[PDB]
Design a protein around this ligand. Sequence first.
Ligand SMILES: Nc1nc2c(ncn2[C@@H]2O[C@H](COP(=O)(O)OP(=O)(O)OP(=O)(O)O)[C@@H](O)[C@H]2O)c(=O)[nH]1
Ligand SMILES: Nc1nc2c(ncn2[C@@H]2O[C@H](COP(=O)(O)OP(=O)(O)O)[C@@H](O)[C@H]2O)c(=O)[nH]1
Ligand SMILES: Nc1nc2c(ncn2[C@@H]2O[C@H](COP(=O)(O)OP(=O)(O)O)[C@@H](O)[C@H]2O)c(=O)[nH]1
Ligand SMILES: [Mg+2]
Lengths: 71, 433, 152, 430, 430, 48, 50
Amino acid sequence: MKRVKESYFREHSDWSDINGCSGAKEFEGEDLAYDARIKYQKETQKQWIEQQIREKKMREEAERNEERAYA
Amino acid sequence: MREVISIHVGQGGIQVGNACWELFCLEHGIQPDGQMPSDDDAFNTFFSETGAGKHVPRAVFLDLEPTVIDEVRTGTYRQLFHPEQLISGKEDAANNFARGHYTIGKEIVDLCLDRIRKLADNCTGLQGFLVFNSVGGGTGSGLGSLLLERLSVDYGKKSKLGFTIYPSPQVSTAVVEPYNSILSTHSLLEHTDVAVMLDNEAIYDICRRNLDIERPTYTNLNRLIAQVISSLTASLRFDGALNVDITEFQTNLVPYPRIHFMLSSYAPIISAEKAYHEQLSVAEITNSAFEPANMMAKCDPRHGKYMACSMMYRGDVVPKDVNASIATIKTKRTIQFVDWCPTGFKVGINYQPPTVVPGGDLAKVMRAVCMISNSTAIAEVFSRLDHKFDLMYAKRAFVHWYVGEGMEEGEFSEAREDLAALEKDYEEVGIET
Amino acid sequence: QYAYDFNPAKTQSLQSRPIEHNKFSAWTGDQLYRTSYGTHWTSKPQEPKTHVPPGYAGYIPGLKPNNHYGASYGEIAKNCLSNPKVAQNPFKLASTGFNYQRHDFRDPSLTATTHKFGAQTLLKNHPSIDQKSNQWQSQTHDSFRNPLHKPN
Amino acid sequence: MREIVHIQGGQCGNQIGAKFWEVISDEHGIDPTGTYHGDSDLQLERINVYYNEATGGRYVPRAILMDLEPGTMDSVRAGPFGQLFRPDNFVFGQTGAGNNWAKGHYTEGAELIDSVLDVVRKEAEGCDCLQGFQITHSLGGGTGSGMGTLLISKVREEYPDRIMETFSVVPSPKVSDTVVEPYNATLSVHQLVENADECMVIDNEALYDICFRTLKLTTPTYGDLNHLVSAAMSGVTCCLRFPGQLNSDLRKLAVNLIPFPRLHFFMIGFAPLTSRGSQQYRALTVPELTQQMFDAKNMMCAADPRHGRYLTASALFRGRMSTKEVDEQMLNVQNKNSSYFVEWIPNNIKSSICDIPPKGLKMAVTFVGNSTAIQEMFKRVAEQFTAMFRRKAFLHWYTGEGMDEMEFTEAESNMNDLVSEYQQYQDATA
Amino acid sequence: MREIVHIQGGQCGNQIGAKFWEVISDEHGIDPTGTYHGDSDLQLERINVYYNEATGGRYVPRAILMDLEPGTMDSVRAGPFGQLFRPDNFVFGQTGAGNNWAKGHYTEGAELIDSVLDVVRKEAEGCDCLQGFQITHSLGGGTGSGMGTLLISKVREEYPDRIMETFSVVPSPKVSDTVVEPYNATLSVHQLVENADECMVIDNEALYDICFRTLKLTTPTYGDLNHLVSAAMSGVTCCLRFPGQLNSDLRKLAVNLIPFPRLHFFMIGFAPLTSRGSQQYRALTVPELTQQMFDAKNMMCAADPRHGRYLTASALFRGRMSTKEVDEQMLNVQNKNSSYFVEWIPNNIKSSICDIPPKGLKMAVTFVGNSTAIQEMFKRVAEQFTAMFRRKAFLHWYTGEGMDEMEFTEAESNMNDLVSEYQQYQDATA
Amino acid sequence: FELSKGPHSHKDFCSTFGRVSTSDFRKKNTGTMGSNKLPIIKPFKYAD
Amino acid sequence: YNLPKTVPLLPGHCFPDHLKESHHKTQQFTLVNNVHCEKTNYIEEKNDPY
Ligand SMILES: Nc1nc2c(ncn2[C@@H]2O[C@H](COP(=O)(O)OP(=O)(O)OP(=O)(O)O)[C@@H](O)[C@H]2O)c(=O)[nH]1
Ligand SMILES: Nc1nc2c(ncn2[C@@H]2O[C@H](COP(=O)(O)OP(=O)(O)O)[C@@H](O)[C@H]2O)c(=O)[nH]1
Ligand SMILES: Nc1nc2c(ncn2[C@@H]2O[C@H](COP(=O)(O)OP(=O)(O)O)[C@@H](O)[C@H]2O)c(=O)[nH]1
Ligand SMILES: [Mg+2]
C-alpha cells in the first residue's frame, strides 16, 4: 500500500519545518509529547467505556421488559 | 485497482456474509441504501462505482432454500445488492452431499459461473476469491465442492481462500454431517489454496468466558468472524507501516502444497464492563492471542509443534513493541517451534483502528491483533472425525441415501484414504531430523 | 400488644382484584418479529412491504387471480400491493372462529322452473362500465406520474 | 414454493382434518369466509404452501376428502370453518365398508378411487413445485385402513420422488373400539411398510393418559384429542412456513431420522402442556421444555420409550431462543443417559429452530423419536392377530369378497420379520 | 449453589416439614403467596438453597411429600403457608400402612415408590449443584419407618457421593405409642445404620420434658414440639445460608464429628430457651449459652449424656459475638469436666459462627453431639425386642407377606454387635 | 488426555428417565457406612 | 425506636388454639384411576359479560 504517515499520530512535516536537519541534530523522534499524549488519550478512552456502559444497561432493561410483560 | 470477490454458499455462508457486509459498509461509511449520507478510493477493494451514486458489492450469494435469500431481499439492504446476483433455487439438498453435487447443483452452477464471469471481467487487478460455506450441510458442501472444482480450471492460478466451519468435537446439529464433512474435505484438499478452521465450540467458549453473555446467539459468532475477516483484509484498503496482501500468505505460511490448513485467534476480546479497566498493552494482547484457550478452533497447540505464524496488528501498535513481544514469545518455554524453522513469524501492521458496529458486543480499542497459525496440532480434529465416520460406516448406515442419488458406493473409500494420507503428511512433517 | 399476622404489606387477592380485560396482546407487541434481520437495526416488527426486487418468489397476492396485463414485474407488484383491500374486515369475523355465528352466510334472484329459464345470472365479481379499449388504456400522452420525479 | 396437498379419508381422518385446517387457518389469520385478516406480513408470505388463491381474494385449502359414506362429510361441512373446502373436492360413496378391510380396499374403494385419483392428479399438476403429500387416517377401521392405503400405493407408484407422510391412529388393545382391529391393522401395516415414507403412530390410549395426567381437566373429548393431534401436525411443518435460524423441511427430517429404509415408524410429542392450576407456576425455559419433551408420559404412543434404545431423535423448537441453551441441554441429556442411546451412531439427535412461536406462547417444542421401544405395539398386535386367526374367527367375512388366508399369512410373516429385524439393531454393539 | 432438596413421609414427616417450611419462609421473609417482602439484601443472595424460581418472580420450596394415605397432606394443605408446595410434589396411596414395616416396605411401598423416586430425581437433576438430602421421619410408625428407609436405600445406590441426613424420631417405651414398635424400630435402625450418613435422634419424652420444665407453659402441643425440632433443623444449616466468621456445612460437620463410620448417631439441643417468668432475671451472654447447651436435661434425647463420655461435639452459634468468648468458654468447659470427655482426643469440640441471628433475638446456638451414652436406647430396645420376640408374638403379621425370621435374627444380631463396639470405646484408654 | 474425575463426574447410565424381593436383603456390612475395618499398609515413596 | 408491631415466631410465642366452633376435614386430594387430581378451590371467579 502507501506510507502516508511516518507514524500513526503525526503526519509529515511541512518543508518550512525542515530547515536544517542535514546534520543529525534534530530527529523529532524524541516526542516531547509522549506523557501528555497518553494522559489525554486515556481520558477519552474511559469515555468510551462510560457511554458503552449506558448502552449495554439500556439493552438489558429492554430485555427485562419482555419478561415483565409475559408474566 | 485491487479487488477481492466474496462467495457465500449455504445458510451459514449467508448468515456470516450478512454480518461481514454490514461491517464493511459501516467501516467505509456507506449507508444501507448504498450512498454516502447526505452531507478516498479505499472502498474499491470491496465495492465498485455504478457511476451514478450508489455502490454495488463484488459478492455473490448462493442457496437452494429460498427462505434466506427472500429474507435478504425483504430486509433493509434490498436496494444495496444487485437484484440478479442473489441466486436461489427451489429445492434444498436436505443435508445430502450427493444431491448437491450430482442432482440439483448442476442446474445452478452454470448461472453462478456466468455471474462470476460478469463480475470478474469488471475488475482489473483481481487479488483473489474468498469463499464461505457450512461444511456440515448438504447443499453447502456439495455446491462448495462444485464451485471450487469448476473455478480451479476456469481461472487456474488465481488465489482462493476458504473459511470453512467444521463440526464441533462433541456438540452439533445434524446426525449425518460426518459423511458430508469427509467428502468435502477430500474435495477441497487439492482445490483450495488456503483453508481456515472455524468450528463453533471455540467461539462459544470465547463468548461465554470473555463476553460474559450466558445466552449468546449465532449473530455474535457472525460478528466475530466478520471482525476477523476485516482485520485480515484491512491491509489492502488502509495505509500501513508494513503491508501484506493475499499473495503474502501462500508465500509465508505454506511449507508444502498439501499443508494449507490453519487456525486463527483474535485479541483482545473483552466486554465493555471491564474492557478498558486494564491497560490493553501490546504485550498483554499478544500474549492473550497466543493463549491456548483463546484459539478460534477447538484444538490444543501444546500437543504439537508450530510451523508458521502470521500476525496482523491494527491500530496504534509500533514495530519496536512488536519485536519486544516477539522476543518474549520466543523466550517462553510452553510454546516451541519445529526444528527446521529458525524464525517463523510474519508481521503486518496497519494504522486503521477497528470499527465498532452498533448493537455489537466488543469494545472499540486503539489496538488489536489477529493471528493465523499453521501448526502440527491440527491432526486431532481429523482423527476424531475419522473415528466418527468409521463408526457409522462400519454398519453401512445411511449409505442408501447417497447411493440412490447417483453416487458410486466406493466414493467413501478414497475420501477415507485421502484423510489417512493427510495424517501421513502431517505426522511425517512433524518429526525432527 | 397484639398477636402475629401472616400477610405482609396487605396484598389483596388476584382473585378479587378488578376483573379481566382486553390486554391479551400485552406481550405480543413483538410476536411476529423475525430475527434473521431484525435485532440488527430495529427492535420493533417490520412494516408491511411496499416494493420488492425482481425474483422475489413467494406469493404477491394480486397477480394470479386477475391476470395482470403487460407491465413490469415490479410495477405490477407495487400496484397490487399499494391497492386497497388485501386486508380490513367488512364482515368483522375473527380469525379464531369464535365469532362464526355473528354473520349469517348469505349470497345476495328467485329461481323458478314452473315455465321457463332458471339458469340465474353470475356472481358480482365481474366488470361493468369499465369496458374500455386497450389502445386507450395503454396509450396516453403525459398525464401520468412523472417516471423520474422523486423530490429531493 | 415446495408446497404440499392434504388428503384425508375415513371419519377419523375427517375429524383430524376438521381441526388441523382450523388451527392452520388460525395461524395464518384466515376467517371462516376465507378472507385474509392477518396482522403482520408473515402470515401472508408463504400462505401458498397450504392455500390456493381464488378470484375475489379468497383462499381455499388444497384438501381432498375421500370416503365411502357421506354422513361425516355432511356433518363436518356444517361446523365452523366448514365453508372453506371446495364442493368439488368431496368424494363419497353410498354404502360404506362396514369396517371390512376387504370392502374398503377391494370391492368398492377401488371402484370409487378413480375420481379421487383424478382430482388429486389435477391438484398436483396445478401447483408448481411439489414437496409431498400428508395423510391422516386410522388403522382400526375398514374404509380408512383399506382405501386410504390403496390411494397411498397408487400415489406412491406415480410420484416416487415426492415425500409421503402418514398419521396413523393404530388401535391400542386395552381400550378396543372394534373387535376385528387386529385383522385390518395387520393388513394395513403390511401395505404401509412397503410404500409410506414416514408413518407417525398415534395412540388413543396415550392421548387419554396425557389428558388425565398433564392437563388434569375433568371432561376431555374427541375435540381436544383432535386439537392435540393438529398442534403436533403443525409443529412439524412450521419451520417450512416461517423463517428461522436453521430451516428444516420434510425431506431433511426424512434423511436425518431413518437409518434404514424399512424403519420409518415414529412416535411424536408436543410441549409444553401444563394444567391450568399450574400454568402460573412453571417457568418457561429450555431446560423445562426438554425435560417435559423427553418425559415418558408425554409420548403420544402407548409404547414406553425406556424399554429400548433410541435409534434417532429430532427436536423442532418454535420461538426466539439462544442456540447455546438448546445445544448444551441436548448434549447434557444425551450424556446423562448413555444406557438408552445406541452407541454405534454417536450424536444421534438432530435439532431445528423456527422463529415464529404458536399464537399465545413464546416457546414450543415438537419431538419425533425413532426408538426400538415401539416393537411392543407390533408384538401385541401380532399376538392378538394370531390368537384370533388360529380358530379362523371372522375369517369367512374377509374370504367372502375373494380374499384368501394366504394374504393373512403373508402379512403376518411380514410383520414378524419386521419385528425381528427391528429388534436386531437393539442389541447391536460396536 | 450447594442447595438441598427436602423429602418427608408419614404423618410425622408431613407435620415436621409443615412447621419447618413456615419457619424457613419467615426467616427469609416470604409471604404465604410466595412473593418476597423482606427488607435486607442478604435475604436474597442465597435464596436458591431452599427455594426454586417461578414465572412472575415467585418462589416455591423444593420439597416432596409422600404417604400411603392422603389424610395428613389433606389436612396440611388447608393450613397457613399451604399454597407454597406443588401438587406434583404430593404422592399418596389409597390403602394405608397399618403400622406395619413389612406392609410399608415390601408390598405397597415397593410399587408406589417409583413415582416419588421420579419426582425427587427430577428435582435433583433440576438443581444446579446438589449438596445432599435431609429426611424427617419417625421409626415407630409403619409407613414412615418402612418407605422412608427403602427410599433412603434406593437413593443411596444412585447418589453415593452426596450427603445424607436423617431426623429420626425413635420411640421411647415410657410413651408406649405402638405395641408393635420394637419390630419396626429394630428393622428400621438395621436398615438405616448402613446407609444414612448422619442421623440425629429426637425423643418425644425429651420434648415433653423441655416444654414442661424449661418453657414452663401449661398446655404444650404438637405444634410447639414441631416448632422446637424445626428450630433445631434450621440452626444446623443457618451457616450455609448466611455469612460468618467460620463457614461450616453438613460435610464439614460430619467430618469433624464422626470418628468411625459405624457411629453416626447424634443427640441435639438448642439454646437459649426461657420462660416468660424467667426472661427478666436471666442475662443473655456467651457463658449463659455455653452453660445451657451442655445441661443434661436440655438435651433432645432420652439418653442421659452424663452416664457416658462424649466422643465428639459441635456448636453452631448465631449472632455477632467474640471468638474470644467462644474459644475461652469452650476450653473452660472441656478442661473443668475432663471425666466426661474421652481421653485419647483433645479439643474434641468443633465451633462455628454465623453472623445472622434468628429474628427477634441477639444470640442463639445449636449443639450436636456424638456421645457413647445413646447405647441406652439401643440396649433397651434390643431387650424389648428379644423379650417380645422369644414367644414369636405378632410375628404372623410380618410373615404373611413373604418375610422370614432369619432377617429378624440378622437385624437383631447387627444391632447387638453395634451396641458392643459402641460401648467398648467408652472404656478405651490410651 | 485422561481427565480423571473424583466426586461427582457427569456420566451416568440411569440419570433422568431410566426406571422401568423379600428373600433378598443386605446381609451384614455390605453398606458403605458400616464395616469399621481399614485397608492394608503400603510403604510409599513421597520424594518422587 | 422501631419496636416490632407483631409477634415474631419463636419456640414459645405461637400459642395455637383448637377451640373452634366445629372441626371438619375437607377432602381436597383425590386419586381416581391411579391418577392424582385436586379440587380447583382458590381459583374460582364468579361472572362477567365477556
Ligand atoms: N457459526 C455459524 N454456523 C452455522 C450457521 N448456519 C449454519 N451453520 C452450521 O451449519 C450446519 C448445518 O448446515 P446449514 O448451513 O445450516 O445448512 P446448509 O449448509 O445450507 O445445508 P442444507 O441444510 O442442506 O441446506 C449447522 O450444524 C451449523 O453448525 C451460521 O449462521 N453461523
Ligand atoms: N383421535 C380421534 N380418533 C377417532 C375419532 N373418531 C374415531 N376415532 C378412532 O377411530 C377408530 C374407529 O375407526 P373407524 O370409525 O372404523 O374408521 P373408518 O373405518 O375409516 O370409518 C376408533 O378406535 C377411534 O378411537 C376422532 O374424532 N379423533
Ligand atoms: N414430634 C412429633 N411427633 C409426632 C408427630 N406426629 C406423630 N408423632 C409421633 O410419632 C409416633 C407415631 O408415628 P406414626 O404416625 O405411626 O408414623 P407414620 O406411620 O409414618 O405415620 C407417635 O409416638 C407420636 O409421638 C408430630 O407432629 N410431632
Ligand atoms: Mg441448510
